[PDB]
Design a binder for these strands. Structure first.
Length: 594
DNA sequence: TTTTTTTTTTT
């Protein structure tokens, strides 16, 4: 490896050519599309990219999900180039905790370690918080993640740093002071939400440079969603209505919302039954109430809901009514279906960028859907070839057996698919994950399998999270019993079903021996940005996005080379029929054999 | 040529 990039030594040999290409084109000013599989060590490649850019003198920003942050700090904690230029991190308020409230909670619930941690400065206690504290050269006190270690059942939202907490409380001081972290280091880590929020603040005229010389976006497929959430302001009624109890026109606003299975989807002002009177009356009834005596945590409820009111005030945004999983509560949203001005503002403030993810391309090296999703200027965009190593598909045997009945939410399909699922559960030599597209489909399957499989069965639901079911899936495997997981939603994309009780030895990993696709993941995306992107583009957008979700669902099986005896099952009979529209999903499966 | 997911951790 003559004349290698900094940190290139610990990069997998397979990704060295891609790292070389990405480094050159990013240095050339292009916004680079670099796609590589999960187990190829994209974190090491990113660390080498950032270090090489940093020693050029570049102010470098690495935007990545907070979960990935700990891996990225470690991967470039020790390479000499970043050691000289320094590596810092930018954290928003939701990372921290109110010392007053979290201590006031520990006394109420008699949690000795929790109160004793806050008494004494809320010092970092985890290895991650302590080590990142040394790497940052800042002491990361009052961290939420540390507080969870002492009491997992703490009401996280009740205790988080709001913007309303007093200036004198240590947590807000630490956050506000650390807003200047980009001053004191060459490479800056943050989440996609932080980058989107920074871009929005830049547009409207602090925590990031005004111009980013080089930007690496890890898990870049999620960056689009972060902009949508940041640019969406949602009004929650029951928390507000309950907070004033401790106005009548707002009750009439809810009654009015009821007049207008699609309820007010992607319609800015075409329906105005009484919303603009009810909005304006709510605007004044909430902002005129006395700040004096308003609880330091209740003024936040007022502020966030008037923000949603004044985001629906402009009329420059779409509206949509949603309902909580717990109960049929009223929620009003003001999102944006066109995100070009904001995204373009980000890309202008960037000299060069590398977009890194495992699913960036629709087919081959075509990143046009991602280029349009993120509004990457075509002049600056660049599509490098992907890295799809052979070992990502080798341990997988694809079975011909499938469910003849087509998925139509019927009881008829549910039992037939359940019989095939039971057949998979018997032959399974480990954990089994069956992927469902709907709550209805998985609840139907649960009704047909709850008695048959008994304790083995895990059902994701409105009351059972993917994280909850993931914990039970690991636990049931710990107890030697072979679980089956009726998974939906986040189980499709973003669960690490690789066993960490077997670090050095992947050949003996059998946490997930059977993956079962019950249905092609069509209709899995309903965001305002994508729904508009579908209305203009047609069913191609539907099929391309479904294939992306399909590849991500298949990516749960193999997470590192050297595993063996992995089973892949796709039961959607449409795959095996003639229909031309299922041709892409056929082609993905064509890379397995026998 | 299709269909309903609750991500994340910003102000």
């Amino acid at each position: 490896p003559a004349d290698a990039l900094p940190g290139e030594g610990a990069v997998r040999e397979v990704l060295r050519p891609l790292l070389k290409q990405a480094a050159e084109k990013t240095a050339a000013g292009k916004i680079v599309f670099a796609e590589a599989a999960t187990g190829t060590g994209k974190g090491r490649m990113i660390a080498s990219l950032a270090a090489a850019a940093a020693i050029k003198g570049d102010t470098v920003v690495v935007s990545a999900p907070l979960a990935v942050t700990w891996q990225l700090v470690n991967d470039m904690k020790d390479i000499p180039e970043v050691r000289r230029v320094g590596l810092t991190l930018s954290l928003g308020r939701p990372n921290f905790i109110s010392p007053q409230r979290t201590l006031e909670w520990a006394i109420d619930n008699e949690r000795a370690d929790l109160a004793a941690w806050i008494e004494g400065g809320g010092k970092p206690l985890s290895l991650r918080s302590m080590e990142t504290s040394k790497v940052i050269s800042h002491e990361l006190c009052w961290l939420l993640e540390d507080a969870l270690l002492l009491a997992e059942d703490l009401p996280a939202d009740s205790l988080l740093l709001t913007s309303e907490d007093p200036a004198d409380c240590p947590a807000q001081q630490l956050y506000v002071a650390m807003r200047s972290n980009y001053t004191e280091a060459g490479i800056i880590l943050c989440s996609h939400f932080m980058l989107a929020a920074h871009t929005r603040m830049m547009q409207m005229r602090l925590s990031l440079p005004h111009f980013i010389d080089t930007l690496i976006v890890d898990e870049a497929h999620l960056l689009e969603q972060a902009f949508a959430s940041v640019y969406t302001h949602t009004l929650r009624l029951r928390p507000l209505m309950r907070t004033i109890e401790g106005l009548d026109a707002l009750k009439e606003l809810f009654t009015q919302m009821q007049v207008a299975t699609n309820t007010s989807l992607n319609v800015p002002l075409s329906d105005v039954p009484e919303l603009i009177p009810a909005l304006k009356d709510t605007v004044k009834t909430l902002g005129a109430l006395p700040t004096k005596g308003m609880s330091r945590d209740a003024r936040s409820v007022i502020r966030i809901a008037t923000r949603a009111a004044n985001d629906a005030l402009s009329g420059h945004s779409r509206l949509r009514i949603e309902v909580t999983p717990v109960h049929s509560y009223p929620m009003l949203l003001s999102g944006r279906s066109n995100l070009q001005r904001a995204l373009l503002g980000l890309w202008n403030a960037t000299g060069g960028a590398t977009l890194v993810s495992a699913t960036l391309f629709t087919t081959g090296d075509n990143g046009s859907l991602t280029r349009w999703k993120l509004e990457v200027p075509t002049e600056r965009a660049a599509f490098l070839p992907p890295v799809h190593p052979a070992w990502t598909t080798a341990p997988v045997l694809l079975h011909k057996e499938f469910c003849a009945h087509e998925p139509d939410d019927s009881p008829e399909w549910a039992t037939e698919c359940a019989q095939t699922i039971q057949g998979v559960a018997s032959t399974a030599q480990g954990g089994t994950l069956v992927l469902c597209t709907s709550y209805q489909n998985t609840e139907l399957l649960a009704g047909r399998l709850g008695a048959a499989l008994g304790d083995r069965l895990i059902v994701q639901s409105k009351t059972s999270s993917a994280a909850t079911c993931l914990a039970q899936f690991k636990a049931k495997h710990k107890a030697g019993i072979r679980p089956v997981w009726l998974g939906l939603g986040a189980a499709w994309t973003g669960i690490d079903l690789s066993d960490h009780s077997l670090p050095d030895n992947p050949e003996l990993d059998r946490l997930l021996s059977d993956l079962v696709i019950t249905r092609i993941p069509v209709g899995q995306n309903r965001s305002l940005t994508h729904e508009r992107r579908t209305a203009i583009g047609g069913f191609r957008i539907i099929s391309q996005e479904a294939a992306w979700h399909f590849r991500q669902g298949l990516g749960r099986l193999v997470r590192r080379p050297g595993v063996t005896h992995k089973n892949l099952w796709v039961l959607d009979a449409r795959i095996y029929g003639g229909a031309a529209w299922v041709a892409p999903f056929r082609q993905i499966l064509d890379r397995y054999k026998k």
